[PDB]
Design a protein around this ligand. Structure first.
Ligand SMILES: COCCOCCOCCOc1ccc(C(C)(C)CC(C)(C)C)cc1
Length: 230
């Protein structure tokens, strides 16, 4: 189950993963400077980030406004105006989620960057002060191979790696919406790994890891190679 607020590693992972899933987009460079143009790839990039931050409720097709407000409160940022526009059900499309949130973004850019660690100084400070989280510039394998982290406190083999690959969350529950298609893992294959993982504790992590690797032996290697900055 997802934890709130989101930390600077968790927000960074959401931005970077969604950028990789749209890496051929015309507007990629604009996203890097916190500009979100009105085009289809940007619409779906925005939906992806809301989802990967844990702030899109797939059951009711609505933003988790309670958790968005919690992010601001926990970061000591004033709640912005225009929350009504971002609230309520969408029709599920990227276009609708973009249209509901673009003015909220445009009208609060720097407060949003503060709340979601989108400023280099604030992110750097979080990472320096949270040394038990994988640092920027360090591979998942190298970080998780240290301090016996892969044991997960117990007898596991991939407890840390499965978390940083976002196969499981902090509760060792599978992340159901993870998209590994470009790595050669279809939605059906990933779903089968989720289903295979009544397991308990870090054994969920190990089962996810071993199942993904069985489907494609390079998929997790590619994530590890991408992992210094995701
Ligand atoms: C090389 O590293 C570049 C990393 O860039 C990370 C920053 O990402 C660019 C900004 O993209 C977004 C994506 C979504 C959003 C939304 C609209 C979802 C708002 C948010 C993040 C405050 C919830 C805002 C900016």
């Amino acid at each position: 189950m997802w934890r709130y607020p989101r930390n600077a590693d968790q927000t960074f992972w959401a931005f970077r993963t969604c950028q990789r899933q749209s890496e051929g987009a015309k507007s990629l460079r604009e996203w890097y400077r916190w500009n979100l143009p009105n085009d289809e790839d940007t619409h779906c990039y925005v939906k992806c980030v809301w989802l990967h931050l844990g702030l899109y409720n797939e059951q009711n097709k609505s933003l988790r406004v309670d958790r968005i407000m919690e992010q601001f409160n926990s970061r000591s940022v004033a709640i912005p105006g225009g929350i009504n526009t971002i609230s309520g059900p969408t029709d599920g499309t990227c276009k609708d989620i973009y249209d509901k949130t673009i003015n909220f973004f445009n009208n609060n850019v720097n407060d949003l960057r503060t709340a979601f660690y989108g400023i280099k100084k604030l992110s750097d400070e979080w990472f320096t002060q949270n040394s038990n989280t994988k640092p920027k510039g360090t591979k998942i394998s190298d970080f998780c191979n240290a301090e016996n982290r892969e044991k997960g406190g117990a007898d596991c083999q991939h407890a840390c790696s499965a978390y940083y690959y976002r196969l499981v969350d902090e509760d060792n529950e599978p992340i159901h919406f993870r998209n590994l298609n470009i790595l050669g893992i279809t939605d059906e294959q990933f779903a089968s790994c989720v289903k295979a993982s009544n397991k308990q504790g870090c054994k969920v992590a190990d089962t996810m890891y071993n199942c993904v690797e069985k489907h494609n032996s390079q998929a997790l290697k590619i994530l590890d190679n991408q992992s210094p900055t995701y």
